[PDB]
Amino acid sequence: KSKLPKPVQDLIKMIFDVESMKKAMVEYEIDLQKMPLGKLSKRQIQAAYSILSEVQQAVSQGSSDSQILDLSNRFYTLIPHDFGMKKPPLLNNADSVQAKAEMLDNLLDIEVAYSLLRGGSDDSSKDPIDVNYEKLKTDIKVVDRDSEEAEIIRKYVKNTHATTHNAYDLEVIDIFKIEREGECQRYKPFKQLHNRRLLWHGSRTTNFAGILSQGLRIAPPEAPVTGYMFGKGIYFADMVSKSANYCHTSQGDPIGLILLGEVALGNMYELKHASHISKLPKGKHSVKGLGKTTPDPSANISLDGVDVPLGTGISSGVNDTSLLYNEYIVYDIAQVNLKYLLKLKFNFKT
Amino acid sequence: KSKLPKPVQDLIKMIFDVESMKKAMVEYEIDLQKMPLGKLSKRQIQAAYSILSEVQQAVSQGSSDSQILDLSNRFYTLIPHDFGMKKPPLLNNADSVQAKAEMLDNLLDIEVAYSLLRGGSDDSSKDPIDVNYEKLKTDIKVVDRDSEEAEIIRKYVKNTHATTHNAYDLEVIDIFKIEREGECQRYKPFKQLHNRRLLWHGSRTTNFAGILSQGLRIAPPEAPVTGYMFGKGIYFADMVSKSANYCHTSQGDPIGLILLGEVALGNMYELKHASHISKLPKGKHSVKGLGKTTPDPSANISLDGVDVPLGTGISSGVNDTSLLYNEYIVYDIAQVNLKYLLKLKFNFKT
Amino acid sequence: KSKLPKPVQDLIKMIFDVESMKKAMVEYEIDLQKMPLGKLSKRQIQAAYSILSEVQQAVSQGSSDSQILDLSNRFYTLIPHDFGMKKPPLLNNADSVQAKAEMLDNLLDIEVAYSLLRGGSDDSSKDPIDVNYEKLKTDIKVVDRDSEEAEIIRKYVKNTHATTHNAYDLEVIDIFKIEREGECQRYKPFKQLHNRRLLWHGSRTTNFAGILSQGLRIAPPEAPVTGYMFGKGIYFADMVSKSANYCHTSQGDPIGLILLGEVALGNMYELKHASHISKLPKGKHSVKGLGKTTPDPSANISLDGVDVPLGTGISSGVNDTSLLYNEYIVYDIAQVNLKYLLKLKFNFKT
Amino acid sequence: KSKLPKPVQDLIKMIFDVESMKKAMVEYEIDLQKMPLGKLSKRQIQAAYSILSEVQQAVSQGSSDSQILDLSNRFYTLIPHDFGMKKPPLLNNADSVQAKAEMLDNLLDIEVAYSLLRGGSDDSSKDPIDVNYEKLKTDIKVVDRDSEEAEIIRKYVKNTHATTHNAYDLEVIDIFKIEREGECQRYKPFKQLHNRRLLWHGSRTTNFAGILSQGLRIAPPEAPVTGYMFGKGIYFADMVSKSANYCHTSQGDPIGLILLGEVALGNMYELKHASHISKLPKGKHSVKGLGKTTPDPSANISLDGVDVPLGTGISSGVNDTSLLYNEYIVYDIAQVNLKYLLKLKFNFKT
Amino acid sequence: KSKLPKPVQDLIKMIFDVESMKKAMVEYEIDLQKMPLGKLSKRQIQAAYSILSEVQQAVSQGSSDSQILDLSNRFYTLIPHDFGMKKPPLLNNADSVQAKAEMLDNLLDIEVAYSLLRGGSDDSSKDPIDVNYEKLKTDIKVVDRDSEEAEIIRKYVKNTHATTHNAYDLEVIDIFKIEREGECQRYKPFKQLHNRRLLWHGSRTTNFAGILSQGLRIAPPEAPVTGYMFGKGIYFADMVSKSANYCHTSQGDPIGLILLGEVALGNMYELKHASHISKLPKGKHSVKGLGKTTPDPSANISLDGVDVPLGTGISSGVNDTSLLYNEYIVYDIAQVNLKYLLKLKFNFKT
Numbered sequence A, B, C, D, E: 001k002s003k004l005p006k007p008v009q010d011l012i013k014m015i016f017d018v019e020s021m022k023k024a025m026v027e028y029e030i031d032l033q034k035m036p037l038g039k040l041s042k043r044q045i046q047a048a049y050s051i052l053s054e055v056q057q058a059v060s061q062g063s064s065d066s067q068i069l070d071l072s073n074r075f076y077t078l079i080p081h082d083f084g085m086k087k088p089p090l091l092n093n094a095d096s097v098q099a100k101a102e103m104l105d106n107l108l109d110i111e112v113a114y115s116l117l118r119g120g121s122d123d124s125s126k127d128p129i130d131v132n133y134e135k136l137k138t139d140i141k142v143v144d145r146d147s148e149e150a151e152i153i154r155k156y157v158k159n160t161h162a163t164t165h166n167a168y169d170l171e172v173i174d175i176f177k178i179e180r181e182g183e184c185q186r187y188k189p190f191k192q193l194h195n196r197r198l199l200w201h202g203s204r205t206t207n208f209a210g211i212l213s214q215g216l217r218i219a220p221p222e223a224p225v226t227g228y229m230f231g232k233g234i235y236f237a238d239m240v241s242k243s244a245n246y247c248h249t250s251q252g253d254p255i256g257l258i259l260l261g262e263v264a265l266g267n268m269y270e271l272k273h274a275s276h277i278s279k280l281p282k283g284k285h286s287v288k289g290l291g292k293t294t295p296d297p298s299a300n301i302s303l304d305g306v307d308v309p310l311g312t313g314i315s316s317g318v319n320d321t322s323l324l325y326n327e328y329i330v331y332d333i334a335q336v337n338l339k340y341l342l343k344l345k346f347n348f349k350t
């Protein structure tokens, strides 16, 4: 039987859960009869991305309908949604393209997870636990609840979580230290870059197999730009509250996963409103969206050079921003070093 | 084409939505491969109820396990849940039986809805809209947004909805007046009973076909008692906030349905803590669970004799109660007269 | 002596107050010794705008300093700020250009007001009150406190003002009905455009002479784009709280002015994040920035066809927006019809 | 049997309740064995007042103890408090004298009530209800719950009651219109004085017999001045929250009484901090203590000339005051016309 | 070049800023054309104080106008305010005299600062930084951010700052240890007095040159008494929130200065309402105004004998007070030992 610790074994079952994949798809109204899990394709998803981009263009130009109707019908022909009646919803605005793209993003990681869950040798010489674990290409270790690392992290979570949106309370059930294969050399260069911070990154549970196996990725060129406040990059927050909302947990499934990564920010280009760049000013190596709220700077803390902004949340200098929280973006995956993964229990106050 | 107004036509598509049925089942982790919608049976559900009751008994006695294991395995053999690994959850406590029973309740109405959605004559001499509408055996009319009825109702909803649990805001999209076949004579007697009130009753969208076609029903004898604070009856609230939580809506599906019914309460037996009776004291005809919060009595209002407690929520006399809201229970379905049905939009504040 | 009502006479003294102009300039650290009020020039302000735009460009490119230093020194040579020591602040980021542009905007209206306050015939055949009043080219009337108009407006102000940012409370001291010369024909066309709404527009008191005499204007081409979430246009809000923050009042001067204008919106292009367009999609005639909060739609109200969204503030459908409040933008001044002007007393809670 | 309405009969039993008198005395730690109700004397209470004033003087001078000890022993020799051990508390500070004076105030009205409850003819030719009612020398009438008067009053109570100190909620159980003998001519003069307002005045239930029979009175000369922010006068509030705190109700006895009186204020001398005057500036006829909170002026309302400030509570112009609420004081009892008396139910939120 | 640390150099530029002086004067509506900075006189300010006192007297007596008009005209003849029209405001009430006195207080320290900024030798043998520094006659040192002193102070600031008036958040930018010449011997005596506490004292930035050079001073005899709740003395608070409001910072200038001083309180005379004494009871050496809120006593802390009440804010025993916060007053400047000065950044939540 697996020599893996019990908490890791449970982590493995969580991310490679087929029922969870199926559930996310039905939550999207996708018809599994026509589009089963094993039938998801990458080229199919790229095609869908392209259509979405075309809708956004049609929307910006103000297409004289008809074109919007055909594009909409084309999208649903590729992504078989079952509605029954009322007819398929029309994709005629930014809000609509954003939702569909967010879905394609998730469906791609599910496709990635299903494709890994079915490879190599589906024999039993070894239990499914250790095999699937190996497929992640990531070394996973449990962090003792009573250590220095755990204390810092828990405080990070406890302090950057306030009451302004306290629709729930956070409880850390498990803390894992992580270092995926590949993310141990690639970073070494950007390490010779100042302003490295330990930041939060939340994401749907059904995307973690893809995230651990492939690392955080930047949206492909066929993907619509709408939905990314600061262009196609990798986003992080310094307040657990901001990231936790991307875990999409609920009273039904109050358990979610969240990452903590070391990101070599370098000189940050500061902005207060959405701006599509990806182009970056000379000398800048990241973007910091300025939020209304920020961790108490006096409470900052470090270690090895990586700053950890676990100060309680206070009002920042500028409020003339649309953003509520800080937001950090990098446009090179090499600037990111995934360090920890937290299994969190969301208790809703309701 | 259907002569029904557009809002009613939309109501019809909502309650007879197969994708919605399928989605509620997958949300329960049920494996549709083994247990498709068309395969749901009433006797199967009664059997499942019986097992649940046996678990509750085993739990109260403190069964020396083994018996709990076999009962648990028996439940999952009847209700095929797909877990993958970790093994099926053990049903060894009140909290566990309550969740499963709540599920069986919902699965029964879905079974009822699927069985109605497939009967009579699946021909096309008439569009599916009018046919399915007739299957409800309920007369449905739209209440003009600018009428007296609509004004009273909206205020009822606006005032009994506070900020203590404001995880969302309520918006009335449609208001329907209703009178199902059968619920027009049966009540006439209990009408000759004082203390009639117009109260709220929320419920999952997927249960409305069953509710409209069969009316509100009291739990069967095989059903576990755990989960019903005051025995097997029909529950109502006088604060929309209390009932709205049973609609189980979310950011994904922020739309829900809620009923308003006239209930001939008669003399109410007042209690402050859960009590399983169903037996009722001589001269009493209902139970009022006393809550910490209550609509402002000064703001009460009537019409035809039916009191409408739309006063804003204030602290009640007694707080020495566990209950947060008032709760009304009747043990005879004839004491209930369903009058209106509201389509509501839940806007979460998050 | 002036036949004007006392409240209008007081309004006149307010907007044509020289001490107020002088005070706004010193608040900007401007040195009146070098740059007196009478020395402000329009070409000087246009030049300053150009420099600011050049800084923004330098900032976006990431100019290798030196260029940033010379541009900064050029700006302060044109706009003489007295610092004393520490040296002039460097304009090397978006946040810096925005503040300076906001200042140039205000300084231009002050220049406009000073230029009107000194023209025609500074004789005394007529008192300064009626003369200056005429210079506004706007017909001003007092709205009786106990009328229908006043009631609607006050409710508009009372309901769209919540407690989330209740750093103050609002009190309407005077309500004026207005129709400036020119804004009585120019609009007639766009009146034949649907979706006309009565919206709020706040602004510094020292800008009202310019606003009444010239009407709301769209930023000139030399002006930096940074600072306008949706391009150079005319912005309105449907929640008095949003607009009131642009009055820049305080415990020292708790009195401010705010406008209510009828804007022929037409088809609104809906967005959730900043987007510089001005280009507009075919068929769209305005932009609606979607906020997290919005007036209760059920409470909407009209008259003559102009909708007045005085519903209390509730959570809107989407929160996936950066914006807190709704925001409406039009890119043609003819789409705007200034109707009322309110003198408001801000009571801070502190 | 009494022809008095039931609500008035209940009012009568409330204010002439001996058990209530006894209870207030034991709440004061007074030993009824030594000082029974029937043993309370007016001269005894005046003597006690004098001692208290002497303590205040000793406190202001900073008496070298001993004098403080003898005065303290003298007070407790007159007012027999049972402590048991620890010894009698020392009266050596303002806070101590204030509490004792407040007690003497209450004990005097109880003495007054007991002295009325035992006079004339304790025969039974008439029931105790009508007799005691007559002893009040006040004409009492019930105000129908569905009238104009009741509506105004209830709104007055509902709006001037907020959430800042919402340790309870208010419910009006009975509303009485009142006009005591004597207070129907005496006022006629001051009626020819502007600025008449309908204000709140709360007070312990055990003081109402004295208040109805003798009217609101100003503290006697022997009484300490400490405790009266603005000298010995008659105090009123324009926010039910302020007055309700002087009813001293609780979860045990959540029922209290509160008055509404018409007071001919005249020119008000405005102050922001305690000031002992009673001397009043020429032309002023009352004092208005300026509070941080005040009823919304726009919502003011009148009738017959008496202003009723039932506007919801908002932040007032000045916060540089110690006072939280407005407070009105008059130094001539003739300036007061008691109009209504409300029986209120306090529901604590706890 | 100056050997002073950079943070001290910045402190020096802050308090000796001429633009800041000019700005405070224009904020007062003072006409710099008539009353330039260099034209401010001490005798002129004393004269103005006298007039204010005369107005207060006229107000208390209730002067039959005319006298109020002449006094008002006399005040504005001495203090040249530019209004333009509407005419000069009438000084006919306590609220008016308080504002004017507060202004004279500030104008005097500005006069003091301008008089120091222009003395000795305006040569350049030494840079203006070290010269002006010497003129303060105060030894200034920077306290390392990571020391014991800094930790205690920051906690003092973080805990005595709540959410009840959280219109802003506090950030300590610099912490200076201070000991002015003279305040090193004078205190030695009162050090042999118990109950020494480290308390807060806020003040306008433009008053610090005067405060450091002359120390905290007690109002002169010609000064009005109105405005000083407990007579002319030196006031301190034990909750940073109370003192911070006297820094008069804003979104425009969110930076302020605040002092921490050791005050030898001795026996405190406790009061709950304003009381003009200065006379003090035998054995008492200070006054403590009792507030509704107070630092958690359990969290008290000391060092060398000086208590530091940095407990979080909790409800105090008595609420029967007008005061919201505690307030300490001493009537001998020798009882005060200025120890630290904090540069604070105010972040408004708005």
Ligand SMILES: C[C@]1(c2nc3cccc(C(N)=O)c3[nH]2)CCCN1
Pocket (backbone or CB within 6 Å): A200, A201, A202, A203, A227, A228, A229, A235, A236, A237, A242, A243, A244, A246, A327, A328
């Ligand atoms: C909306 C979007 C996003 N913005 C974020 C800001 C802070 C944190 C996260 C996170 N995932 O933890 C964010 N995710 C844009 C890129 C993909 N999803």
Ligand SMILES: C[C@]1(c2nc3cccc(C(N)=O)c3[nH]2)CCCN1
Pocket (backbone or CB within 6 Å): B200, B201, B202, B203, B227, B228, B229, B235, B236, B237, B242, B243, B244, B246, B327, B328
């Ligand atoms: C938990 C339970 C329930 N209690 C309620 C109290 C007030 C209202 C409702 C409602 N459905 O609107 C309630 N439903 C017990 C019976 C079935 N579900």
Ligand SMILES: C[C@]1(c2nc3cccc(C(N)=O)c3[nH]2)CCCN1
Pocket (backbone or CB within 6 Å): C200, C201, C202, C203, C227, C228, C229, C235, C236, C237, C242, C243, C244, C246, C327, C328
């Ligand atoms: C920041 C900016 C602005 N945005 C607004 C949104 C709603 C209302 C107003 C207003 N003035 O009442 C706004 N003003 C951009 C254009 C000039 N000032």
Ligand SMILES: C[C@]1(c2nc3cccc(C(N)=O)c3[nH]2)CCCN1
Pocket (backbone or CB within 6 Å): D200, D201, D202, D203, D227, D228, D229, D235, D236, D237, D242, D243, D244, D246, D327, D328
């Ligand atoms: C404390 C004191 C008092 N101050 C008040 C201010 C507003 C209302 C009332 C009231 N009784 O309704 C007050 N009572 C001083 C005079 C006797 N009691």
Ligand SMILES: C[C@]1(c2nc3cccc(C(N)=O)c3[nH]2)CCCN1
Pocket (backbone or CB within 6 Å): E200, E201, E202, E203, E227, E228, E229, E235, E236, E237, E242, E243, E244, E246, E327, E328
């Ligand atoms: C209003 C007044 C004042 N009262 C205070 C109470 C606590 C602290 C302070 C402070 N300056 O930090 C105070 N200042 C009266 C004397 C001058 N200003």
